Amino acid sequence: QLITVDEKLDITTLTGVPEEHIKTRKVRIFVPARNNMQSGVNNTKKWKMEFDTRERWENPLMGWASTADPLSNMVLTFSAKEDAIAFAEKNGWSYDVEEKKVPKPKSKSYGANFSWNK
């Protein structure tokens, strides 16, 4: 038989994350925009949640960038806004969702460019 729990699945205790990176890390759920350089829209389809950016100090010996934040390069991809919000809640990371913004329909017709008076 099933048991009842109203407790938001929080599994922060099982994930195995250091305390500092669960209480000081804000992740943003956003649908990636399109670099204006290209006109393809296949990278503006799935929602992604990305952890907040952290220190990137220069390395003294070779000048390479060096980072102390483990969750930096991690960007998880989630198909829908609801599912991504769920991941933040059970993992205990703070979230600030940004609504998808899709190009509004625009009316175009080759005839217009040859308008008597535009």
Beta-strand runs (E) in 31-117: 47-51, 56-58, 65-67, 75-78, 94-95
35 vs 117, beta carbon nearer another protein: 35
Alpha carbon 111 to chain centroid distance? 41
21 vs 31, beta carbon nearer another protein: 21
42 vs 117, beta carbon nearer another protein: 42
- What does the binding site for another protein look like in residue numbers (CB under 8 A)? 1-7, 9-11, 13-18, 20-21, 24, 26, 28, 34-35, 38-44, 52-62, 64-80, 83-84, 86-87, 91, 94, 98-99
Instruction: Pull the structure tokens for residue 33.
Output: 């925009």
Q: Nearest to residue 48, comparing CAs of 37, 70, 33, 35? A: 33
Shortest gap between Cβ of 46 and another protein (angstroms)?
9
Q: What distance, in Å, lies between the first and last C-alpha atoms of the chain?
A: 73
User: Residue 40 in contact with residue 34, Cβ under 8 Å?
Assistant: yes
100 vs 106, beta carbon nearer another protein: 100
Shortest gap between Cβ of 51 and another protein (angstroms)?
9
